[PDB]
């Protein structure tokens, strides 16, 4: 059995192992694949692995040998899985691999906005501690989370993890939980409508899929409803925000800070308003990417392939179309 | 009617909180800081003096015969000769517990910046690294998860315990060197350990103990050699808890993957402090205590101390034995 990874570099840039996949067939790993080389490289493969390499109906029909696709992610927005279905190709993803990676990144962003440790380290190195008229200093107000309300938009695995951490930091937690009425074992906790979340939360973290209903959720109106000095964190999907309104909220002081691992355009423009905004922290879509999570992602991908071989495919995202 | 002087109020309130709780209790004057030659001038006539780090010795206290009460804007009072104050009949109060959450959260701000380097990647984006990247994402520093790592907590008072609860919630195992208390928290995995066992078993060590003869140079070459390679050290407690040389060498050798330090043995540091030349060392200027919430609490507790002194029953007295 012949297996091809079209963009394996981000999953394994030399610090983990393909061994679990290599046990199941003949593997070829390309670090990335430009669009004009997709059919060439995928030709002859029984199984294709893709993270973000697109597979549309025209590519799928040009690969008659293709029997199974596994996506190296929870999201599969760049794979036309419906077209795969009608051609009789199951498509699997991996949910749950990065719950801890992502939830901890929400707090890495948030605490760096609150304390700005790296800034103060830089200032020490420029001699700011000697230059200071006091025994200590800070160029950025030090902010504590204790007693603030964490509002969690979307309450799947990652959202729930964010909530458990928030609780342990002494925050109140409120969740907009449309897909599930899940009650955690900690207080204070409460389910709220989306409107109520924005009026009551001091920190808002986004953990929902991008859909018609959630496009531009964080808009000028919901921002205006928030308490001044609030924080926004987004490790989910860029188009959940109106980027303009958020930049203006940062500059006005409505938002004391924003921590963003995703943007509507990746990579961003130099003149994207979020790159010129004060108190904005941005990371390059790496929240998912701890060595532990990628290791887990590798194993779960091997499990998906093993299951397809055994005749009972798991994590199928196009069951309705087969 | 009562006269109150703050000799170094800037660090407590640099314009973002309010002296109102103190202003209700007397006539307040707030100096942002006070050099040593100006202490007597400024404190003269005051019933109550507030000091964070302005020193008060026997000679200053005797030159202020009007002085009836000192409140220290900190838990520590090492620069105040509180024994001399006692014999002159001056109660000295401090404020314990104001910064428990501020400090515990700073441990994790340092640790998560070492593990994810969010600010580094923000800087690289701003230098155009995301456009220059051949992939949809990138990282110049391996992203490291705390899940399944062991947090070793040296000293298990309030701050230490807070650090432990947070660690647990991040999926870490917790072990504590807890000499002053056999306190059992309501989470697992948790275990009490000896100090040597803590260093051999912990992936992250955080210091939360007072500086004494017994704990000076606790983090020495020997305990560092016992640690697993790739471990992290965090110190928001006291600079002399470390042998700074051994730690620099551990960082350069790769024994320590990183160190997060809010204090140093000399503050401010020299250019030739070995910790300023060491790789993977994150340093912040003694600000772990300093969240706006903690300073707000510190203000209120200071008003409570003064209110209690006026009512004749002074609270948080640190020199009762000399009174």
Description:
The structure is a homodimer. Chain A is globular, with a radius of gyration of 22 Å. In chain A, helix 11 links the parallel strand 10 and strand 11. Chain A has 2 domains: 132 residues, 3-Layer(aba) Sandwich (Rossmann fold), CATH 3.40.50; 190 residues, Rossmann fold, CATH 3.40.50.720. In chain A, helix 5 crosses helix 8. The longest helix of chain A is centred in the C-terminal third of the chain and has 19 residues. With 322 residues, chain A is an alpha/beta fold. Chain A: Keywords: NAD, Oxidoreductase. Chain A: It comes from Nitratidesulfovibrio vulgaris (strain ATCC 29579 / DSM 644 / CCUG 34227 / NCIMB 8303 / VKM B-1760 / Hildenborough) (Desulfovibrio vulgaris). Chain A: Belongs to the D-isomer specific 2-hydroxyacid dehydrogenase family. Chain A: Pfam families: 2-Hacid_dh, 2-Hacid_dh_C.
């Amino acid at each position: 059995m012949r297996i091809v990874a079209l963009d394996g570099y981000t999953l394994n840039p030399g610090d983990i192992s393909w061994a679990p996949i290599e046990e199941l067939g003949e593997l070829v790993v390309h670090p990335r694949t430009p669009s004009d080389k997709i059919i060439e490289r995928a030709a002859g493969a029984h199984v294709v692995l893709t993270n973000k390499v697109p597979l549309d109906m025209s590519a799928l029909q040009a690969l008659p040998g293709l029997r199974f696709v596994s996506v190296l992610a929870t999201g599969y927005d760049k794979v036309d899985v419906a077209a795969a279905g009608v051609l009789g190709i199951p498509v699997s993803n991996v949910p749950g691999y990065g719950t801890d990676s992502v939830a901890q990144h929400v707090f890495a962003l948030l605490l760096e906005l609150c304390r700005r440790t790296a800034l103060h380290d830089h200032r020490i190195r420029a001699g700011a501690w000697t230059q200071s008229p006091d025994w200590c200093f800070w160029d950025s107000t030090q902010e504590e989370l204790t007693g603030k309300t964490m509002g969690i938009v979307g309450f799947g695995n990652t959202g729930r993890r964010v909530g458990r951490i928030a609780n342990a930091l002494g925050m109140n937690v409120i969740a907009y939980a449309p897909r599930s009425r899940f009650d955690p074992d900690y207080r204070p906790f409460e389910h709220v409508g989306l409107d109520e979340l924005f009026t009551s939360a001091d920190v808002v973290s986004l953990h929902c899929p991008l859909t018609p209903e959630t496009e531009g959720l964080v808009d000028a109106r919901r921002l205006a409803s928030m308490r001044p000095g609030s924080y926004l964190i987004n490790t989910a999907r860029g188009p959940l925000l109106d980027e303009r309104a958020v930049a203006e909220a940062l500059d006005s002081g409505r938002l004391a800070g924003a921590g963003l691992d995703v943007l509507s355009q990746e990579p961003p423009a130099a003149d994207n308003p979020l790159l010129s905004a004060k108190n904005c922290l941005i990371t390059p879509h790496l929240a998912w990417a701890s060595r532990t999570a990628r290791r887990t992602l590798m194993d779960s991908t091997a499990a998906n392939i093993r299951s397809f071989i055994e005749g009972t495919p798991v994590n199928v995202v196009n069951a309705a179309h087969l």
